[PDB]
Design an enzyme around this catalytic site. Structure first.
Site, PDB file in Angstrom:
ATOM      1  N   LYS A 140       0.809  -1.200   0.000  1.00 19.29           N
ATOM      2  CA  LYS A 140       0.000   0.000   0.000  1.00 19.29           C
ATOM      3  C   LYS A 140       0.850   1.261   0.000  1.00 19.29           C
ATOM      4  CE  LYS A 140      -1.615   1.572   3.981  1.00 19.29           C
ATOM      5  NZ  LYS A 140      -2.552   1.541   5.141  1.00 19.29           N
TER       6      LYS A 140
ATOM      7  N   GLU B 175      -3.665   5.758  13.271  1.00 18.90           N
ATOM      8  CA  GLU B 175      -3.014   4.466  13.065  1.00 18.90           C
ATOM      9  C   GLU B 175      -1.774   4.270  13.962  1.00 18.90           C
ATOM     10  OE1 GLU B 175      -4.842   1.262  11.637  1.00 18.90           O
ATOM     11  OE2 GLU B 175      -5.381   3.379  11.689  1.00 18.90           O
ATOM     12  N   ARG B 176      -1.017   3.215  13.724  1.00 18.77           N
ATOM     13  CA  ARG B 176       0.172   2.951  14.509  1.00 18.77           C
ATOM     14  C   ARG B 176       1.302   3.939  14.241  1.00 18.77           C
ATOM     15  NH1 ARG B 176      -1.287  -1.363  12.318  1.00 18.77           N
ATOM     16  NH2 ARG B 176      -2.276  -3.106  13.467  1.00 18.77           N
TER      17      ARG B 176
END
Lengths: 461, 474, 37, 461
Positions: free
Chosen positions: A156, A182-183
């Site tokens: 991605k 997100e992380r």
């Protein structure tokens, strides 16, 4: 102007101002003291009695009732222009990369109305990316929102970078990356991913990420958006803007709403899910000065895409790109599912009859390929029409001619990169479909640019 | 007359001192933004801000308007792009009218109406033949995102270039860009002269999305009650429902059945009950409505969908599968219906279609035997093979409404086997070229259908066809 | 010509059972993809 | 007596009266001004401080705080008797058909207690309708509630009209139609449906319909009911009373409750669902003066009949009639499913051993017909007992002898109508079961009245 804190309940801070001196909503109010930094809260609701309730953008530990607060007189405003390229920021438009301060000329509020009806471009145009599969089969439209469905192992971020590169490359458009919820490791990884793919120079990054309070997660995209809006409105280019997990964004929405004691929907979400989504999405558009095309990563762990959160986001999508683990472990490295991916601007009206017919052409072939796939499964290759058997070979070639070497991948593979104009993609697949290259070996279309390059390689093995 | 805001939040305000405001009265804020008196709490009014809520803070003054919720109305609006308050968005000036209407008003009683009998030609073959729409009808258009619902409203609107009917495209919660595109398409097809666009995009205040359909409907009602004929399309009653739900427990109304309020049904039924076909006594005016429901994952059994279904008079379902098979319109004629039926369908079409309903009903079953033509002579290439042919004449390019007459010949051609000796990759062109042949030659036959259209002079018809037939280019 | 007939359909149901079966099986493979992304 | 409006929040109006001058609940309070008409609200709750909260029966737009209100001293009262026949009304008992005012002698309140225990008839009796299938297989009982399940295309209104006609006809009973919460077009359609079937002369109609506020939808049936109660109590007849979508009624229940800020159940419904339903249903009964038999259309879009709304309504049902699309497209035109339809008064106790045995007779045959149906499906008509094969022919005849020409359908078909006494229905099917007409052609039982009429037609083809 100045107020004093009345209440502190989590990310929610209630501040009393003087009569008639109350902040417009969305106004950054800064609070200072008592151990070091400066907390920024955003005006949310006028409760009355000159109290206004706010949402924090950082922790409110240590805050004490009575502390002075200052209405900045404007929404959270962030640096814009050249100064932000290559720099990484947080919601407040502060550099989180320890690299100096941003010598930006201006700082725009992250809250603002979407371009007005008459500033809107009234015709769809394909945003030409480098990539053959998305341009042929699931075109990006300028001022379009694309749902990118991927799993990292499907490359991605390599896609994101090729996009950033190719749009910078063959148009003049910069990009903004907004990491939302997100992380933080993943953000750091991407940062380095594209700091030595060189792409970082064409990008400003904004990070929210799941460690941050909801107020930060909720606004972070608005920062990225604001930044991208500069290059469209000033500078008049076709800017990118990636939001990684836009779903995290609507979910930050839910947390803040709960904190403000709202409805909520019977499925947990804010009363204002859609509104807030629209308020973000609607600014991502092709104006007459033209521009912003958002690639939005949509994950949602639950995998129910009928959920209100994904449902709403989908309402805005104009194309979806589907990264497929199957194609990845198969070699096709823009591992985009040709059949799963789609674009609303795949009309003959937008890309012309030929492109449209070639694409609907490639689609049917690849679809037929699957039917026959199941046929030989349950009837063997026995009783396989010489024509059917024929349009299976063309599928295998098409499937391969849909892969292509990325510039961003150069530094590993090194092919080198390939940018393929739709003009040439369409032509390419048109010849394959017409049977102009049946005679060529099928591994001759794997990882080439134009169809011209595929004959070059039909001279090996 | 003058009140003042004491608490504002999420676009909802407690205003004080509007003593004699009426329930649902239009109000104007210091800064020109409008609001509506939603609730008359004992000692304050609950005002819903209907626009930019940001510069409205506590202490802000509100003025009475003296008018219940109402919108500009009349031919002054044809061609203008407007929001539900009726203020112009296309920058083409002010709207020069003096006639208004309440966005909430009663629906025609059971005695004010007469049965739908006049056809509303959509121009779309699949719909005008099966799923025919009459004037005064409420026909639901339901399907996933990106199955071409809006495209269907546009074709239908475009097809009113004939011009008994004035069109209201109401866009609820759509992307502004999409609406801007819709307006431009209407322009390029010369179809905007008779079209009002009411729009409340995705970024607008929820109450604004909430009102949009009631505005567009009020605009249509001016014409119906005038004796004229209007067609209103509410692009996304889904987005309205959600908009309404937001406004609800912002006002903190108890959550009801499903995620939505208890009155979410009423929300919709109240609305498209206002579309009607009036008795001759009441002027014979009509308002036709094409509500859109947007399904997720084709879930038609969902709450809002099933509601509106039990409200309208039939629905056109748009299969997602079909649309990504390039089939267009992606209509699912099987499950799709018009409860009004051939009552709103000229004799000619009502005829040639009658058989066609059956035709591809049979082709639905034998469909399964797709690429396996083996059964020879039985219920074989007689049914199946000629079914493949019918499905071709159903297909139809975007923004290409076909005049009934042309539809009718085209259908009659295939339905009477004139395509059977002809291929299948050849059906689409054989139709396009059959019609072009009539328009320039056999106009006698065509105009015969435009005048009390029952088609007849058959056999002369079959002859006229065969004089183009014989293929000569398959 | 008579023997050649039996044999063909003799051969035809045998390929049709096998055919049916092969569908079931293959279907039961495909179905995993219907649910788990 | 007089009050002034304190609060207006939707269909809810809060009105302050003078101390000790407060309205009994359910009392119609009229409000007039300021632009034209007259709004009627119904007292709901005494909030205290001489304020009473009400539910509107019409829009409360334009209401202003302070407006005078007048307690009428009674619940919404509506015209009754001869005067209402052929006339269509709304909840308020106003004529919505522009046909004059109702010259009714009296106006009864729509709120009232159900007949008291000792006024109740204590034995079940079949309400003899014209129709063979419902009288043999799923009998209507006087003071019974019947669930009618249909889809219009299955000729639900033709059924309603034949019922109205046949009860008027062969008893002396008038009818009331209460349209609750459905499509106004459908109401108008039915109105004309039966204005030129002539049935309208024996009926008063009351319309709520889904455009109306919830207060109206909720009360509308009570108006219809009140009207029907006249002809039972005065006039002592066996009146009908149709409620179209009784489900809409309980759902109006829910809206009003919410508006009053009640519970609600965890499935959205009122705390008082069952109570309200019982309050309506319990008035529909066979008193000693005898009467009211309600045919209630139950739709509910969701199709879950375990839902509280349908569940409650079902608690009251005494028979169900099931209109079947299959039987309709099959020709059987009282398209009533013989197997699905049921009546609690199909006891030998209520219809006698013979009728009971004939019906349980027909039932088994038609059931057996279905078993054998599946048998020949999976075992061919090969190996079909000469007796089994035999009782398949009797099923096809029975299935057909269950259809019958309606008076109401005359004006199209024109057979003409047929009214078939249970005495004769029972006899009819008894002979078929005994084998007294195996020799007759099976299309000879289609659309006849008595079995006598079927031999008449065994003399054609």
């Amino acid at each position: 102007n100045k107020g004093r804190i009345i209440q502190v309940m989590g990310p929610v801070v209630d501040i009393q101002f003087e009569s008639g001196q109350l902040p417009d909503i969305y106004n950054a109010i800064t609070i200072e003291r008592p151990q070091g930094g400066t907390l920024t809260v955003e005006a949310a609701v006028h409760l009355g009695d000159n109290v206004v309730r706010c949402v924090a953008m950082a922790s409110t530990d240590g805050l004490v009732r009575g502390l002075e607060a200052v209405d900045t007189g404007a929404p959270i405003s962030v640096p814009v222009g050249k100064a932000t390229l290559g720099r990484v920021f947080n919601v407040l438009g502060e550099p989180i990369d320890e690299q100096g301060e941003v010598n930006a000329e201006e700082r725009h509020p992250i809250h603002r109305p979407a371009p007005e009806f008459e500033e809107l471009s009234t015709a769809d145009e394909i945003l030409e990316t480098g990539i053959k599969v998305i341009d042929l089969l699931a075109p990006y439209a300028k001022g379009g929102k694309i749902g990118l469905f991927g799993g990292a192992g499907v490359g991605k971020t390599v896609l994101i970078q090729e996009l950033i590169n190719n749009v910078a490359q063959e148009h003049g458009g910069l990009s903004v990356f907004a990491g939302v919820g997100e992380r933080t490791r993943e953000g750091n990884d991407l940062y380095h991913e594209m700091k030595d793919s060189g792409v970082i120079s064409k990008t400003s990054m904004v990070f929210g990420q799941m460690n941050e309070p909801p107020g930060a997660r909720l606004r972070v995209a608005l920062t990225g958006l604001t930044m991208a809006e500069y290059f469209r409105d000033r500078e008049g280019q076709d800017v990118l803007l990636f939001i990684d997990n836009i779903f995290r964004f609507t979910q930050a929405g839910s947390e803040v709403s709960a904190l403000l004691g709202r409805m909520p929907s019977a499925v947990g979400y804010q009363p204002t899910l859609a509104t807030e989504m629209g308020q973000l999405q609607e600014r991502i558009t092709s104006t007459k000065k033209g521009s912003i095309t958002s690639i939005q990563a949509i994950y949602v762990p639950a995998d129910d895409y009928t959920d209100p959160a994904p449902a709403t986001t989908f309402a805005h999508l104009d194309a979806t790109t589907n990264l497929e683990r199957k194609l990845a472990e198969m070699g096709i490295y823009p591992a985009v599912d040709p059949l799963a991916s789609t674009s609303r601007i795949l009309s003959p009206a937008v890309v012309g009859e030929e492109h449209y017919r070639v694409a609907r052409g490639v689609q049917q072939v690849l679809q037929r390929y699957n039917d026959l796939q199941d046929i030989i499964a349950i009837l063997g290759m026995d009783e396989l029409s010489d024509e059917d058997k024929l349009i299976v070979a063309r599928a295998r070639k098409i499937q391969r001619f849909l892969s292509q070497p990325f510039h961003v991948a150069e530094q590993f593979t090194g092919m080198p990169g390939k940018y393929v104009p739709v003009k040439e993609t369409v032509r390419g697949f048109k010849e394959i479909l017409e049977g102009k290259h049946d005679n060529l070996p099928e591994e001759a279309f794997y990882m080439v640019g134009t169809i011209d390059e595929a004959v070059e390689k039909a001279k090996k093995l | 007359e003058v009140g003042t805001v004491i608490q504002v939040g999420d676009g909802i305000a407690r205003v004080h001192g509007l003593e004699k405001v009426m329930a649902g009265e239009l109000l104007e804020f210091e800064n020109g933004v409008m609001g509506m008196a939603q609730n008359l709490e004992e000692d304050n009014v609950g005002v819903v801000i209907l626009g930019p809520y940001t510069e409205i803070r506590e202490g802000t003054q509100v003025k009475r308007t003296g008018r219940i919720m109402e919108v500009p109305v009349g031919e002054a609006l044809l061609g203008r792009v407007v929001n539900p308050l009726g203020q112009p968005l296309d920058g083409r000036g002010p709207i020069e009218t003096a006639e208004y209407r309440p966005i909430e008003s009663p629906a025609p009683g059971v005695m004010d109406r007469k049965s739908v009998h006049e056809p509303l030609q959509t121009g779309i073959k699949a719909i005008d033949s099966m799923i025919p729409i009459g004037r005064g009808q409420r026909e639901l258009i339901i399907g996933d995102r990106q199955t071409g619902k809006t495209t269907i409203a546009i074709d239908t609107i475009i097809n009113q270039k004939g011009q008994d009917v004035i069109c209201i495209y109401v866009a609820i919660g759509q992307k502004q860009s999409t609406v801007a595109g819709v307006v431009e398409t209407l322009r390029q097809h010369d179809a905007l002269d008779y079209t009002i666009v009411v729009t409340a995009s995705a970024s607008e205040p929820a109450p604004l999305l909430y009102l949009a359909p009631y505005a567009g409907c009020a605009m249509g009602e001016y014409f119906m009650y005038k004796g004229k004929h209007a067609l209103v399309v509410y692009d996304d009653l889904s987005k309205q429902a959600a908009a309404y739900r937001e406004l609800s427990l912002l006002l903190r109304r108890p959550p009801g059945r499903e995620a939505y309020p208890g009155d979410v049904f009423y929300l919709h039924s109240r609305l498209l009950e206002r579309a009607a076909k009036l008795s001759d006594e009441k002027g014979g005016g009509s308002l036709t409505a094409l509500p859109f429901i947007e399904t997720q994952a084709g879930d038609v059994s969902a709450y809002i969908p099933t509601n509106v279904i039990s409200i309208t008079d039939g629905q056109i379902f748009l299969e997602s599968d079909l649309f990504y098979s390039g089939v267009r319109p992606a209509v699912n004629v099987g499950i799709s219906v018009s409860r009004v039926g051939g009552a709103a369908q000229i004799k000619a079409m009502k005829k040639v279609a009658g058989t066609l309903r059956l035709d591809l009903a049979q082709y639905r079953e034998l469909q399964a035997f797709a690429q396996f033509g083996s059964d020879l002579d039985k219920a074989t290439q007689a049914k199946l093979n000629r079914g493949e042919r019918t499905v071709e004449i159903l297909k139809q390019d975007e923004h290409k409404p076909m005049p009934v007459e042309e539809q009718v010949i085209s259908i009659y051609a295939v339905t009477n086997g004139f395509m059977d000796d002809i291929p299948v990759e050849d059906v689409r062109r054989f139709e396009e070229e059959l019609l072009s042949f009539m328009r320039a030659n056999k106009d006698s036959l065509l105009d015969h259908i435009r005048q009390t259209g029952e088609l007849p002079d058959t056999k002369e018809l079959d002859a006229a066809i065969e004089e183009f037939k014989k293929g000569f280019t398959p | 010509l008579l023997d050649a007939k039996a044999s063909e359909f003799g051969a035809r149901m045998t390929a049709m059972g096998n055919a049916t079966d092969n569908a079931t099986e293959m279907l039961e493979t495909l179905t995993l993809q219907f649910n788990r992304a």
